[PDB]
A and B are shown apart, each in its own frame.
With several copies, the nearest count.
Chain A
Amino acid sequence: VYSYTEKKRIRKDFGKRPQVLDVPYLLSIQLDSFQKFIEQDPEGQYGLEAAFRSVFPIQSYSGNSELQYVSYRLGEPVFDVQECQIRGVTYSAPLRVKLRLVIYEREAPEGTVKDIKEQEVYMGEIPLMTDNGTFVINGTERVIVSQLHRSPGVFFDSDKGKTHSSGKVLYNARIIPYRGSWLDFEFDPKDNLFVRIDRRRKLPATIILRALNYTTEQILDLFFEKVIFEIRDNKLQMELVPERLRGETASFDIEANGKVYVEKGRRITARHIRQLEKDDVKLIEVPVEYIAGKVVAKDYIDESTGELICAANMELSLDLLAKLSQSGHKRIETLFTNDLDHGPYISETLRVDPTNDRLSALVEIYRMMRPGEPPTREAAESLFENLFFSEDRYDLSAVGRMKFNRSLLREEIEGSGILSKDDIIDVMKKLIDIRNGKGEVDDIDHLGNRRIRSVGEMAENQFRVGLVRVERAVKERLSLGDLDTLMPQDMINAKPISAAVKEFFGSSQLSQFMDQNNPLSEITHKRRISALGPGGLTRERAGFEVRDVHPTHYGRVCPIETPEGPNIGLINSLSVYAQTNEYGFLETPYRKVTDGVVTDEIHYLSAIEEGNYVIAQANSNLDEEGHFVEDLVTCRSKGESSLFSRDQVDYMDVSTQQVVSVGASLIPFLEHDDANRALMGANMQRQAVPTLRADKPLVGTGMERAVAVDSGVTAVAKRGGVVQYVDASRIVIKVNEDEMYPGEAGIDIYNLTKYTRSNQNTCINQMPCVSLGEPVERGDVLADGPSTDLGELALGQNMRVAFMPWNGYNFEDSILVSERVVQEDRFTTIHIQELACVSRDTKLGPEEITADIPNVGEAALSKLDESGIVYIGAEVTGGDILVGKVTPKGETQLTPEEKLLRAIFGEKASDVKDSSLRVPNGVSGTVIDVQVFTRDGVEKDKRALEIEEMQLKQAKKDLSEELQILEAGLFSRIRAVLVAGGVEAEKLDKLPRDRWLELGLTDEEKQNQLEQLAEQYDELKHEFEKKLEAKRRKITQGDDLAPGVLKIVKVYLAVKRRIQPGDKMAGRHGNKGVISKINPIEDMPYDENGTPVDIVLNPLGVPSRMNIGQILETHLGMAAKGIGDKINAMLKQQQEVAKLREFIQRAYDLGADVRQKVDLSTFSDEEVMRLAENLRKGMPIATPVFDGAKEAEIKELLKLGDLPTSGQIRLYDGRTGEQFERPVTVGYMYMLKLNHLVDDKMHARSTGSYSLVTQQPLGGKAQFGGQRFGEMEVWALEAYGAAYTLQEMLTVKSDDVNGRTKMYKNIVDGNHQMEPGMPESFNVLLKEIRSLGINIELED
């Protein structure tokens, strides 16, 4: 089966691997993120209920006053998205939250609270996204790029190389929470471990451990093992375990139980370990020099005097040993030290600790936390417990605890959002083990450790940032507010909640207006992953390790899509099938491979679970019933490609496109070009500009049917049906009875958007693609938007292209285009510039938009209307008054009599200043629309009245269509009601019943039904009138503009810019360039048939910049045209539908084992004619990104037509008229006009205004400003001679205000001689330095 949009023009596809999972929603990421934000979520999960159950309730300072929370609700949108974009208001919704205030009297620890006040309050408004995932803040539609940061938890970094220049590897354990303060355990070139908090001073970890109710003994017994040295009768015996002595040479005679085991100088091997274990020996004979090198663990206080003799962390000496032997302490607890098993790191860290108890530890740690202000053990412990053990400054979320437990080999996955002592113990143990060699360091360039955050998470974060301030405010207000003060309404405040959310959505490094110039640009802008911004690495202080792509990005991060420039690899694009995980990671769909069959079931694998299983390749040749054609298949076990068997395989790829992004997937033959050219084309295909007539791309990739639909630029049919009323502006769809609503239904009205300004000043417009009576299905396309064609993405245009040097006009990168393209209106676009003039409320009288501009020619006023605004459709070329802006400067209180008299007799209006806005010099165009908005209270002019009447008439037409439909329905109903009285009906109700409902006879049922229908009619009329009045009041109410302004006037100038030598164009394989010049048709090459080629490229840029695929594409394009040509030869010559169907079937049944397998016998023999009409200009061919066609397929497709197999045709020169030897290849190529046309680059300034702070010419093109002479240009000039030239360029032409005037006067009369003079800026620094105590003085 095929949809109706496919039956209009079905696109021939290629490929042999049939897909198993359909392409998901392209905008599903942001849509799902926003849907998981505004919804009633139980158990306080993500969105808004987390901020309501983690913050509320709130209690005063033991005031027995609590503020509870019940629920929240989103208000209705105060404006439609269209009206929102028009008025520039925020597309937001109120937040009605039902709070609960419970207050009780004093002296009640748990007294039953009374006088519960459950009140609903409105606290700020939240912006909503449309069905396209775009936020309309102020007229423009901005978006939020999903950021990529480090997942909360722990990391184990290995610092080496340039670390302290010691050549020793260091291991640092960084614990980073989701919201709070960081922690870092670090090492030194020595064996000393230290701790730090937020890059503070280096302090040992023993003190930060002792602060958490711990002692040195607990430290050593938790970190180090237990070594027993007993004081026997003699020899100071010691317990032996055969595992500790491994790696250490015997420094004495290892003997026990009267049986020698190891001599002095022999190591104990595994066999010796087994021999000593088979005897089960513990006690041996150990000399004194062995214990004399160890260190005592615990303090061994004497019992005769009660004084400590051998303190902790002190190696045993002669006196200490004598004291511990003469006191009576037999049991000796010591620690173990072995650089290969347990390196000494707790002993040195304990001995470097200046503190010994928990109290002084807190004091020192606080003295570190904040310099000075030493507390009497009051602020030390409280700050220490608030920075790392309180939910107020430590918000490690569920993902943080999950990573914490998974990293430490902990069986659990959940816990608490607060740190713990044993957690620090475990992470320090892990650091010690990773230093000793046990374990591996956790790399940071791994997606398992890199977590993404969508718009919902940052929105909730900003909501909490505002909520903490509102909580501080309400707590300081309730801290002394007693019982029975007021309802819980003024206790809360709108600010800064609304302020915080507005500054987040409006002004941030990631909340950015989206490039509304290309549907593909829109799809690739929302599916973007950023690493900068809040909590991200700066672009000027990044390393080469983050820019590179990790092999874990297979199917998760696209490696061939990144902006070319400073941020390479930092800004990426999300894969097509990629999804976000519950915790915030990126999952990829795969197929579960069983022992014998590859089941067609989907499993979303995570980044951490990558190395666990093995993934098969997408293009792996497989037989039927899920079996591989070869036992030896290619796979990847753990981030490394390898070759496995048909049994070890566990998972298979879902498709061949899961690696490429949606942006680069539109590039055909992507497996036949280098990464550099494909990357450059991916960044250029995003910057395409729609033309006047978008042409369908011949060499498609199949994805064009999705990007055009999944975007928000095409009018998608929400409900299928028949197209009743077609119009260039609106479309009416009559819903079919099967899916129509069973009660109070109607028809759908899709109001297309006309030529309106976009974010990139690009003409965006929607055009219909269906006619009357054509049935449409639900989800089908209804009207083609910008750069679309019959529900298919049409970025640029296909043209006849050849590859041969043509007199150097394709010298390096330049393209040559025939005059046919500029003649056929092919590469001409429209630019819509917005010019705004505001009538600010100034002193000495307000500003007016009157039209009586004095001291100006009447021809300049002839363009304005009676109000002062130019008409709709007036051409302007140079600076012309298009708005009548005046500003009073002199005397106030202009009397209306004399005011109108000035326009008739007497003098003119002096207090004007001629502040009327005009268009900048150079830019031309035709005004097409005017936008005016007034301040509340200010009387509107007549043009605002006209435009509001126009929009009211549009709404009136819509509501009148609805009313007439419902009224015809109701009157058919009344005909069916009084049909019992058919004779009176047919005699006096044919014409007049449409206005003479008043009738009556046989009341018993007739009066009941008639009164019920009159009730329904009157209710319908009243409801329609109420809706109309609400719409009118919504479209007529004034709009707030700015503090101290009257009204804002916006005008749109739409200029049609065509192709011309200077514009920049490119294909889709990284073959960019500038158009050389326009050549006539008689000068361009042409084939032996007489068809001149429109474009010729440089065939020399193909070998070096290795992108051969385009050439393939070109060949394929030719084949496409061939089919179309044949179809033309079958359409121009009237041919029976049988031959046409046979040819189309032969074309669609090409011998390539394609998964298409369409059947032409199922068509109605009438839609075949429409299809052939849609194919006469070419045959749209689809090829996958990796399952594309081989060379033989293109060869046999060319063989289907009369085109040559080689693809190279002999061309005849247009100028000379001879035959070009070495037959040049020629075909059809899809090309794009970039958004870098010459009309916004060429600029020159002779003399203009100068800056006020420094006498220097201005810069830029918007203002009349010249270029800038850089310092490197000064170096280049100094390399040459040109002392006079440099003095002229730097002093007289740039800085000398008295010199440039003299130079101008000398030039305007023919005097080529300058004066060095003295630079003002030199004199400026001269003055400043003179003004400073370090003065200066010119000498002779």
Chain B
Amino acid sequence: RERMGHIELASPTAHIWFLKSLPSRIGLLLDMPLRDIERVLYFESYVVI
């Protein structure tokens, strides 16, 4: 009941609550609107770093 496990993801995935919390935290942390973040995450556009 208390012991847990872990899934090793080969691709790191960002949390959903930091995107659709209205407002989002990453949206205010990156100074970027939620639309650009959603279009980048869902594999439609790129963004420089």
Contacts and interface: CB of A to CB of B under 8 A. Distances in A.
Touch test A–B (CB under 8 Å): yes
B15 A1327 contact: no
Contact of A1333 (B1, B2, B4, B15): B15
A35 interface: no
Contacts of A1320: 1
Contacts of A1331: 4
A921 interface: no
B4 to A, nearest CB: 6
Contacts of A1333: 15
Nearest to A1333: B15
Contacts of A1323: 2
7 contacts: A1320-B1, A1323-B2, A1327-B2, A1327-B4, A1330-B4, A1331-B4, A1333-B15
Interface in B2-29: 2, 4, 15
Contacts of B4: 1327, 1330-1331
A1256 to B, nearest CB: 14
Q: How large, as a class, is the contact surface on chain A?
A: under 10
Contacts of B2: 1323, 1327
B9 to A, nearest CB: 13
A1255 to B, nearest CB: 9
A683 to B, nearest CB: 47
Nearest to A1331: B4
Interface string A1326-1340: 010011010000000
Contacts of A1327: 2, 4
Interface of A: 1320, 1323, 1327, 1330-1331, 1333
Nearest to A1320: B1
Interface of B: 1-2, 4, 15
A1330 to B, nearest CB: 8
A314 to B, nearest CB: 40
Contacts of B15: 1333
Nearest to B6: A1331
Nearest to B5: A1331
Contacts of A1330: 4
A1250 to B, nearest CB: 13
A896 to B, nearest CB: 46
A1338 to B, nearest CB: 13
B16 to A, nearest CB: 10
The 6 closest A-B pairs by CB, nearest first: A1333-B15, A1331-B4, A1327-B2, A1327-B4, A1323-B2, A1320-B1
B8 to A, nearest CB: 15
Nearest to B14: A1333
A690 to B, nearest CB: 52
Nearest to B4: A1331
Of B2, B4, B15, chain A has the most CB atoms within 10 Å of the CB of B2
A113 to B, nearest CB: 55
Nearest to A1330: B4
A1317 to B, nearest CB: 14
Contacts of B1: 1320
B1 to A, nearest CB: 8
Nearest to A1324: B1
B6 to A, nearest CB: 10
Nearest to A1323: B2
B15 to A, nearest CB: 5
A458 to B, nearest CB: 41
A1324 to B, nearest CB: 8
Nearest to B3: A1327
A1336 to B, nearest CB: 14
Nearest to A1255: B1
B21 to A, nearest CB: 12
A614 to B, nearest CB: 61
Nearest to A1326: B2
A826 to B, nearest CB: 56
A1332 to B, nearest CB: 8
A1299 to B, nearest CB: 15
B29 to A, nearest CB: 15
Of A1320, A1330, A1333, chain B has the most CB atoms within 10 Å of the CB of A1333
